[PDB]
Design a binder for this molecule. Structure first.
Ligand SMILES: *[C@@H]1O[C@H](CO)[C@@H](O)[C@H](O)[C@H]1NC(C)=O
Ligand SMILES: O[C@@H]1[C@H](O)C[S@@+]2CCCC[C@@H]12
Ligand SMILES: [Zn+2]
Length: 1016
């Protein structure tokens, strides 16, 4: 029924971890093809019965922000390229052009008059202008979450279907810095038939070219059957520019980039400029170019050859369109008319190329290899590994994950109703989706844009967060107010959001204190939202003006709560310590919220004059030599002081954690009877090389293994409470906090690298787990892939993306670190895990950015740390390329990426308030998520439609019976259902009309989309 994703190792032609194990990686000079070899061909391979069919595919790589902002590029470059594309294609019917970035195409199209819109649709209809991929952007594939990869794909393709009436089935990804199999996973479930990639390690390109394995059916690592497989073309050479696209010799290919003769600035660095093609030289030029094409064709299996023709922000000047087009037309005319070449060459599009390849395949002329695995970590040359951008600009990496969740919550909360146009819900959600989609660009989330461009992306994401807040709080007001009493002003703030972890404590003082008093306002309603489709309990905290506060639920049942001081840390440059101060004016109340699946739950905070019956107070202990007092206003318990010492803590039934005298974890004891397992946090720094190649925003080029941060005698703050305890320490550049609520701890790091030029700060965990050279990291928050540390590769090559988690295990024990933000990381030695916190780099790394990374700001990084016995778990065999999380680790990841949302009622009194929403929603099996809920129609449509994306992970069976559980049928979540369809993941094509209007659940590791239709 469902394929087993654990126990059957797929049999594939190329399995990338296996290939890595066997391959050499020596960087030897291949000749004119620097990283390959001198390609030879048999001139008699091609003849009158067997011609080489060559498709020259004009293109223009438009970065939505990099050296300039989106809007600066649009004004200076892209509006011209697209205006001239329209003119030239229209006037030249055989000319073709491919277009990837829909964010720019949409920006342009809505500035066009109707006549030009009509002309534009005509060049799309007739195939001359062809969209490739059709995403809002060409996303990063390392740091991006799969949910946002799908978001930005859907944003661009919904635009194309509405305005152009097209949906691309061929994808073009020429610039992301290394490639992820999450792309064919999403694309193949979104109707795609083919895809193309470019930036893979030069040794891999050489290895696959030698075997003609550059075109392959790329399946997921756990896919035994092959149903996930998507035909993929990997380009063979160092760049997608013209010098590295016509064949192996860039000195020759540069002469066929006709923008490089002088009048455009540009030139050929190999010293031979292009010449205008004339009757006098066409035969000689043709002979040179065809010889390049024939050599490139030797690396592939069919007689159909792809020759991209383009570069960054190309096809801008009218004169550039003419000079490319006319010169190639003369080449084509001569080549195609000379039989001795046995070539037929023409401008083509990407789809035209793939269609012709598969016609060749179907004719029996080639069969393709199967492949699984990924293409990280990329190197473009020598030891230049692009692992730096797994961490660059980590404030915005964390902001990506915050905005991902607020997009989801805002679309889901507002989906339950149709809204009047005057509410502007659709407006706000479209802006939020588009600013988040823009940030998925491979210069956005990657942290590889110029300083002012990163500022542009940040301001855009702040506006998106505000839009999501506006929508969420209007929605909560409606969902929780008796229908006959509900009286909305759509511009008013009924609730403010309270978020404990963004921008985070010591990043921005942004949270509102709930002000209560016996003489003023005795109580306050707070509301929690749970986006996940199962009942959820989680501790939530709020700031309040009195410690004397108790909590009740909708039915006035008392709820156990804990009050703690509000602690902030300060780099005290009188005493030269980093140390905490307690607030004397506000306090934190903490309690367990229990919230329906995809639902809401309301609680009340009420002040009293003295300690309430159901509220406890944390003790606090400051460990430092030479202490001074720490007053806390009305807080009832005096802080205690002690010299630095080892301490140990236990919340609830959960683990016991032991801490060193510098306030870092040293051990974890799972059960009262079990061993204290050594687990040691440590902070270290990497430097930059003085001589030769420098780290910058892309490249990680450390000057040797990391050295320990010298900690001195740090101040340690210990807070012990019934519900929540912690240990926090002020270390140089990092306030490090371990938080305990009774299961796996939460780690928070407030990271301020300050003015530490040329430093990368890393957090390492040291254990006795005998992991050897193996470790696991995730790809896009979707799947965990086995990594093997290789000593044949330098340190920076053994760094991988950690977009949401990493783990190490042996026969008996696993340690999993789950993240709230994508960062770079590795396991550099047996029993270790490490993940980079921030990097500040005073040199440029010579990729075109023209600056280092000197714009660091304080960022709050969050994690969960899960130590587990796994000898009872059913794991994949030794040769399997995947790993899987346990239930606890998967729940821990969900607690970071999609926590409960908190709302504080903004006025004194909420008339018509209700206690709960969604108590009748089905509570689905823990491995199932409703990744997206989105209403797809505006309020005037007779037939309302709501789309759902359902994702089932695969969790290890470790012998918890864990039973129960209602079937989730998303099609019956809203009333008056009339149809239920399974669709592509973008919602743009119906794939199956479903019996009884019931949406089935999906298999482990599968993602499906459903659209329910409702008469209204
Ligand atoms: C939309 O797509 C297809 C093109 O193959 C066509 O059948 C349909 O008429 C199109 N609608 C138009 C022309 O807007
Ligand atoms: O970040 C840039 C940008 O996306 C265009 S491309 C230019 C070379 C360096 C990597 C890529
Ligand atoms: Zn780019």
């Amino acid at each position: 029924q469902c394929q087993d994703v654990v126990q059957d190792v797929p049999n594939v032609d190329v399995q990338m971890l296996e290939l890595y194990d066997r391959m050499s990686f020596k960087d030897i000079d291949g000749g004119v093809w620097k990283q390959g070899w001198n390609i030879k061909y048999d001139p008699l391979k091609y003849n009158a019965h067997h011609k080489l069919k060559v498709f020259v595919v004009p293109h223009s790589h438009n970065d939505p922000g990099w050296i300039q902002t989106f809007e600066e590029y649009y004004q200076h470059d892209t509006k011209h390229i697209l205006s001239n594309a329209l003119r030239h294609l229209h006037d030249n019917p055989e000319m073709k052009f491919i277009w990837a970035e829909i964010s720019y195409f949409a920006r342009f199209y809505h500035d066009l008059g109707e006549n030009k819109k009509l002309q534009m649709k005509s060049i799309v209809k007739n195939g001359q202008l062809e969209f490739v991929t059709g995403g809002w952007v060409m996303p990063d594939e390392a740091n991006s979450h799969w949910r946002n990869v799908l978001l930005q794909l859907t944003e661009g393709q919904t635009w194309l279907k509405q305005f152009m009436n097209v949906t691309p089935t061929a994808s073009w990804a020429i610039d992301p810095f290394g490639h992820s199999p999450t792309m064919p996973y999403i694309l193949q479930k979104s109707g795609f038939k083919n895809m193309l990639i470019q930036r893979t390690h030069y040794s891999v390109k050489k290895e696959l070219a030698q075997q003609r394995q550059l075109e392959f059916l790329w399946r997921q690592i756990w896919d035994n059957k092959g149903d996930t497989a998507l035909f993929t073309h990997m380009m063979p050479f160092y760049s997608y520019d013209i010098p590295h696209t016509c064949g192996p010799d860039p000195k020759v290919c540069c002469q066929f980039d006709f923008k490089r003769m002088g009048s455009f600035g540009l030139s050929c660095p190999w010293k031979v400029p292009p010449r205008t093609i004339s009757d006098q030289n066409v035969a000689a030029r043709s002979d040179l170019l065809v010889d390049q094409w024939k050599k490139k064709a030797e690396l592939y299996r069919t007689n159909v050859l792809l020759i991209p023709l383009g570069d960054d922000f190309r096809f801008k000047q009218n004169t550039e369109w003419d000079v490319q087009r006319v010169n190639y037309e003369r080449l084509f005319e001569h080549i195609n008319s000379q039989a001795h070449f046995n070539v037929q060459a023409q401008f083509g599009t990407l789809q035209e190329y793939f269609d012709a390849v598969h016609q060749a395949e179907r004719a029996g002329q080639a069969e393709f290899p199967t492949l699984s695995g990924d293409f990280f970590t990329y190197a473009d040359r020598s030891d230049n590994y692009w692992s730096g951008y797994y961490t660059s600009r980590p404030y915005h990496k964390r902001m990506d994950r915050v905005l991902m969740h607020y997009v989801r919550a805002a679309e889901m909360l507002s989906a339950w109703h149709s809204w009047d146009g005057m509410a502007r819900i659709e407006e706000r959600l479209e802006q939020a989706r588009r600013e988040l989609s823009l940030f998925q660009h491979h210069d956005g989330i990657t942290g590889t844009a110029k300083t002012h461009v990163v500022v542009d992306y940040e301001q855009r994401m702040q506006e998106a967060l505000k839009a999501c807040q506006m929508v969420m709080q209007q929605s909560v007001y409606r969902l929780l107010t008796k229908p006959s009493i509900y009286s909305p002003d759509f511009s008013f703030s009924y609730f403010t959001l309270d978020d404990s972890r963004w921008p985070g404590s010591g990043v921005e003082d942004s949270r509102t204190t709930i002000i209560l008093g016996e003489d003023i306002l005795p109580s306050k309603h707070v509301v929690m939202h749970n986006t996940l489709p199962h009942w959820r309990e989680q501790l939530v905290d709020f700031y309040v003006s009195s410690p004397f506060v108790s909590v009740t639920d909708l039915a006035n049942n008392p709820v156990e709560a804990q009050v703690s001081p509000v602690w902030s840390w300060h780099h005290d440059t009188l005493t030269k310590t980093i140390h905490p101060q307690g607030s004397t004016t506000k306090y934190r109340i903490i309690f367990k919220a229990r919230v329906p699946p995809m639902g809401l739950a309301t609680y009340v905070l009420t002040i009293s004059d003295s300690k309430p019956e159901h509220t406890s107070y944390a003790s606090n202990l400051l460990l430092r030599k030479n202490p001074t007092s720490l007053p806390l206003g009305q807080y009832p318990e005096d802080v205690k002081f002690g010299d630095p010492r080892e301490i140990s803590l236990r919340v609830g039934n959960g683990p016991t954690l032991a801490f060193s005298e510098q306030g870092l974890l040293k051990s974890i004891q799972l059960t009262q009877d079990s061993p204290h397992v050594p687990v040691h946090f440590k902070f270290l720094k990497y430097g930059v090389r003085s001589h030769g190649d420098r780290s910058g925003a892309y490249l990680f080029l450390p000057n040797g293994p990391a050295s320990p941060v010298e900690l001195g005698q740090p101040v340690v703050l210990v807070t012990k409470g019934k519900l929540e305890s912690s240990v926090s320490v002020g270390l140089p550049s990092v306030v490090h906090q371990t938080i305990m609520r009774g299961g796996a701890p939460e780690i928070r790091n407030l990271v301020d690298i300050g003015s530490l030029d040329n430093t990368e700060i890393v957090m390492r965990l040291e254990t006795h787990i005998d992991s050897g050279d193996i470790f696991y990291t995730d790809l896009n928050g979707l799947q965990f892939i086995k990594r093997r540390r290789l000593d044949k590769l330098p340190l920076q090559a053994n760094y991988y993306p950690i977009p949401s988690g990493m783990f190490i295990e042996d026969a008996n024990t696993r340690l999993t670190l789950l993240t709230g933000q994508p960062l770079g990381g590795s396991s550099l030695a047996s029993g270790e895990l490490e993940i980079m916190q921030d990097r500040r780099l005073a040199s440029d790394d010579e990729r075109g950015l023209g600056q280092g990374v000197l714009d660091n700001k304080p960022v709050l990084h969050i994690y969960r740390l899960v130590l587990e016995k796994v000898n009872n778990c059913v794991r994949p065999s030794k040769l399997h390329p995947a790993g899987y999380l346990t239930s606890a680790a998967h729940k821990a990841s969900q607690s970071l990426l999609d926590p409960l949302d908190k709302f504080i009622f903004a006025e004194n009194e909420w008339i018509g308030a209700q206690g709960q929403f969604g108590g009748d929603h089905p509570s689905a099996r823990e491995d199932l998520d409703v990744s997206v809920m989105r209403r797809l129609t505006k309020s005037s449509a007779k037939t309302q439609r709501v789309g759902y994306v359902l994702h089932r992970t695969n969790l290890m069976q470790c012998g918890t019976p864990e039973e129960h559980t209602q079937k989730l049928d998303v099609c019956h979540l809203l009333p008056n259902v009339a149809r239920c369809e399974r669709t592509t993941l973008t919602f743009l094509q119906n794939l199956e009309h479903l019996d009884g209007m019931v949406a089935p659940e999906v298999c482990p590791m599968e993602t499906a989309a459903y659209v329910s239709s409702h008469s209204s």
